[PDB]
């Protein structure tokens, strides 16, 4: 939970603060920048983000559906896409903070590989200012930043959702530093640096005013060697968009199912918790006992901390049928068991996980020939009905 403070006039020395700033973004992620050349022009922008008059058109304040309002103002050079109200202070800060992004990129990549390779990373300067207004706060669900380098002013506004990077004790920490410019690094920048960067979320806080500046790499730049197939523009364009834009852009091939954005990753971790909780009870050297569904749902509820409906286990049965028997006991409770009597070995547990992920890959692979996941709702398996 170390938060080193160093002047950014001393980084312009270039012989003493490159490793200190680099060591934090490889360990503590978000770095603390104080006393930038902007003084009273950063506090004069809080009266100009309250417009809220503009439509989306890859711009505009976007409220995902409600208290969360994200206003992104598309840069003027971009051809034939703009919405201009007034936004003079936003343009002046956009021109000034370009030097903060170029200088931060110069200090970041001069202790890694080369400081001459970032001039084509900032070349286009197409990044749009992101002005975030929260209504009078759970408005920010756990999420990751868009651009490679995000430098935002904030009052506090920042926590750390459960994840493992900065402050290795993995407790949620709220940090409030007066006179503070906080730098947020993106997911794609971690891929360019192959695992050096992470993310941090926003939490419930009294002050709803958040100004976030994310600087975007050009449309034509590939990312290392492996990203020659997926360019920074393609991956970041797939990442952000907007809810009206996701409705418009991702549209061409219908299916509001959207399971690719939704079910995949969450449903395939159900087997990992469920396989360990059926070896937690059924496997014991003491007094038998049959695995019941009433004591299984709360344990998986503890695993993900999320509410678990009893139908998710039925979806797990639909994808992998032969592991769990759905027979219902005479008392009304629905028991499940395993075919083996010699119990699940750790190697058999790993083989079951590989078989479950392979089966999910097979279902996703066969279902997507109709049109990336295409359309499935993860239909529940039919529960055997009691006779007569």
């Amino acid at each position: 939970l170390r938060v080193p403070v160093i002047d950014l006039n001393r980084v312009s020395d270039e012989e003493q603060l490159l490793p200190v700033v680099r060591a934090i973004l490889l360990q503590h992620d978000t770095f603390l920048l104080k006393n930038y050349a902007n003084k009273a022009v950063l506090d004069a922008l809080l009266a100009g983000l309250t417009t809220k008059d503009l439509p989306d058109t890859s711009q505009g304040f976007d409220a995902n559906f409600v208290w969360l309002e994200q206003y992104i103002f598309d840069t003027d050079p971009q051809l034939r896409f703009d919405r201009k109200c007034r936004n003079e202070s936003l343009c002046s800060i956009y021109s000034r903070l370009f030097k903060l992004g170029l200088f931060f990129a110069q200090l970041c990549v001069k202790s890694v590989v080369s400081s001459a390779e970032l001039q084509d990373c900032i070349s286009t300067s197409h990044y749009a200012t992101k002005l975030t207004r929260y209504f009078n706060e759970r408005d920010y669900v756990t999420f990751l930043p868009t651009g490679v380098l995000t430098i935002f002013p904030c009052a506090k506004a920042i926590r750390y959702k459960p994840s493992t990077m900065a402050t290795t004790d993995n407790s949620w920490v709220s940090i409030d530093e007066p006179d503070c410019l906080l730098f947020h690094t993106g997911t794609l920048l971690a891929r360019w640096s192959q695992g050096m960067h992470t993310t941090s979320p926003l939490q419930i806080d009294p002050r709803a005013n958040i100004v976030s500046l994310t600087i975007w790499p050009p449309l034509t730049t590939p990312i290392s060697s492996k990203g020659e197939g997926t360019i920074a523009n393609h991956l970041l364009e797939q990442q952000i968009k907007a809810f009206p834009k996701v409705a418009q852009q991702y549209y061409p091939r219908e299916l509001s199912i959207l399971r690719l954005q939704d079910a995949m990753k969450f449903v395939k971790e159900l087997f990992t918790v469920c396989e360990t909780v059926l070896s937690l009870n059924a496997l014991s050297r003491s007094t038998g006992v049959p695995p019941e569904l009433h004591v299984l749902l709360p344990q998986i509820s503890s695993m993900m901390k999320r509410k678990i409906v009893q139908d998710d286990i039925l979806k797990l049965l639909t994808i992998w049928s032969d592991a769990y028997v759905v027979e219902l006991n005479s008392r009304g409770e629905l028991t499940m068991n395993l075919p083996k009597r010699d119990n699940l070995t750790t190697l058999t547990n790993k083989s079951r996980t590989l078989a479950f992920v392979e089966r999910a890959e097979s279902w996703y692979q066969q279902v997507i020939a109709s049109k990336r996941r295409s359309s499935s709702n993860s239909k529940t398996v039919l529960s055997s009905k009691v006779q007569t």
Partner: protein, 581 residues
């Protein structure tokens, strides 16, 4: 066995490879935080190593005592190659096994759960700490004056030694613990919570051992402990935390709350045994549903609870309403007098006779509602402790070597009787009750009943009580008690400055009229009380904010409590409040 040697090198390779989020090894940050702050507690989630190796999870679930001999050694080895000379200060470092999926109850503790890991919920009581307990003994034989020693754990009293080596005597033996083992104490008695116990049954209780985790637990709160079962030997404690709301019942609660003005239906559903009158149950329902606690920049904590006070002749029913809400409301604690229930509200240092020593305990529902019967019949300690808990929301313990200020944000429902039986309506309530004004000022609602001579009450009360004896429209009880827990844990209705300033106009009339005709005044606490009653009615209405007519019911609740708590000579105030009625 040598099989632990292939286990050790497996998890030694595991701690250096766990990168779950963004390729970052969180164990290096965990080991630098325990090494820089000199901690001995290491945190490991069960899901992490369970996703890595299920055989280690099966070994931890089967034999955790031999599984714990590998964990501390590999943690000390990792701390030694990460930090030099760490063994000079700290010899051993324990681990904290958290995130147990199968949370058990106290009534499911059976013979099959022996020598295994178990996560149980409960409430802690009986705090005895930092004492040297025993595990070995020696004994001095006085006849020949000799020494002999066995073993003694944590359940029996002591293993009588009565046969010497060569004396062959039954002489008097003395306990030598001047060559003996180390001691660590945390004798805590844990109990089952009353908000999840089935009806008809009694909550069980066990004894827990705490070693290496003392005085970080708060007595009278819900707790989650993960330990081994043999007497439970706790490994990890959690002070953050079966009748709960589901997805199939949460949509119908909004559908029920949207139609047909459910506030009066909840009022009619409050008393099924008798007819009653809405003045007791309106205060009871707004006290159990409660308001919201708010602070401004970390300070100025307002009390979100509502403490109601019942008064009247002892022939009427005042204990049946609290007896119904003790079963109905969650975490409801019925306490009485000197100590009918052998548990109280006040901190105390006292002697204990089971082992015959001195101990300290801060008695007891931090989110719940405490019910006090016969409020006028108490001593100085339980009056001052409830006055401190009614004034601010904390109770301090400053004795037996411990100093702890615990949270006391509980609602208070008190019932009392006047001096002499009769209410004596030609005198105020301050001359009627033996209590004074600042203990009366904490109670915002003062409900009082009287005697009814007329045929109306004779036609209804006797017929309902004879209908109850001749037999051997509202909201049902189960949906109501599930709605209480659903609304009290999800919403927080605020207020908007659009037209709320009008209540500051009507308070400006209502304060002034209490000076010229009445003797007792109205203060800012009544304004805080009607805002809490209006937000409690908005909580019961399940709205986003408080409406404009919730304050009308709030001002009706404060007029029929304050005007009714005075003489008959404030009768003009019965018609003076008729313009806003």
């Amino acid at each position: 066995p040598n099989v632990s040697r292939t286990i050790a090198r497996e998890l030694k390779s595991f701690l250096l490879e766990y990168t779950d989020e963004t390729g970052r090894s969180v164990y290096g940050a965990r080991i630098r935080t325990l090494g820089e702050m000199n901690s001995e507690s290491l945190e490991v989630n069960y899901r992490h190593l369970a996703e890595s190796k299920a055989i280690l999870a099966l070994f931890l679930a089967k034999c955790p005592e031999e599984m714990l001999k590998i964990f501390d050694l590999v943690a000390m080895e990792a701390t030694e190659l990460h930090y030099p000379d760490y063994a000079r200060i700290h010899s051993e470092i324990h681990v904290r096994i958290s995130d147990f999926p199968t949370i058990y109850s106290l009534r499911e503790l059976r013979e099959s759960n022996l020598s295994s890991l178990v996560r149980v919920t409960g409430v802690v009581t009986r705090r005895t700490g930092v004492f040297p307990q025993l595990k070995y003994v020696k004994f001095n034989c006085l006849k020949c004056g000799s020494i002999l020693g066995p073993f003694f754990q944590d359940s029996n009293e002591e293993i009588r030694i009565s046969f010497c080596t060569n004396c062959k005597s039954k002489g008097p033996f003395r306990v030598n613990g001047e060559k003996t083992v180390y001691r660590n104490y945390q004798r805590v008695t844990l109990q089952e919570a009353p908000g999840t116990v089935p009806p008809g049954r009694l909550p069980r209780h066990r004894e827990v051992i705490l070693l290496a985790l003392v005085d970080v637990s708060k007595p009278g709160e819900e707790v989650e402990v993960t330990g081994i079962y043999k007497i439970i030997e706790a490994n990890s404690i959690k002070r953050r935390e079966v009748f709960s709301w589901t997805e199939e019942e949460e949509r119908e609660f909004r559908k029920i709350s949207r139609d047909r003005g459910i506030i009066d239906k909840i009022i009619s559903s409050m008393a099924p045994s008798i007819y009653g009158h809405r003045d007791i149950k309106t205060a009871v329902a707004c006290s159990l549903f409660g308001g919201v606690p708010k602070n401004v920049n970390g300070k100025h904590s307002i009390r979100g609870d509502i403490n109601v006070l019942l008064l009247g002749d002892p022939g009427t029913a005042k204990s049946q309403i609290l007896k119904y809400v003790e079963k109905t409301a969650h975490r409801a604690v019925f306490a009485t007098g000197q100590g009918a229930s052998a548990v109280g509200l006040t901190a105390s240092v006292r002697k204990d006779p089971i082992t015959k020593e001195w101990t300290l305990e801060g008695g007891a529902a931090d989110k719940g509602v405490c019910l006090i019967d016969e409020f006028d019949k108490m001593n100085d300690q339980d009056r001052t402790s409830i006055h401190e808990a009614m004034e601010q929301q904390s109770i301090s313990i400053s004795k037996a070597g411990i100093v702890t200020t615990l949270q006391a944000r509980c609602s208070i429902i008190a019932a009392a009787n006047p001096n002499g039986g009769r209410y004596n309506s030609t005198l105020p309530l301050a001359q009627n009750v033996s209590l004074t004004e600042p203990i009366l000022s904490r109670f915002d609602i003062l409900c009082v009943v009287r005697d009814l001579v007329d045929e109306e009450a004779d036609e209804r009360l006797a017929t309902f009580v004879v209908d109850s004896h001749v037999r051997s429209s509202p909201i049902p009880q189960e949906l109501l008690m599930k709605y209480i827990h659903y609304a009290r844990t999800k919403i927080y209705p605020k207020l908007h400055q659009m037209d709320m300033d009008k209540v500051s106009r009507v308070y400006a009339d209502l304060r002034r009229e209490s000076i010229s005709t009445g003797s007792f005044p109205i203060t800012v606490r009544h304004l805080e009380s009607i805002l809490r009653i209006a937000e409690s009615f908005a909580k019961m209405r399940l709205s986003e904010f408080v409406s404009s007519y919730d304050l009308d019911r709030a001002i009706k609740v404060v007029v029929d409590s304050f005007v009714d708590a005075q003489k008959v000579s404030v009768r003009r105030q019965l018609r003076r409040s008729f313009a806003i009625y």
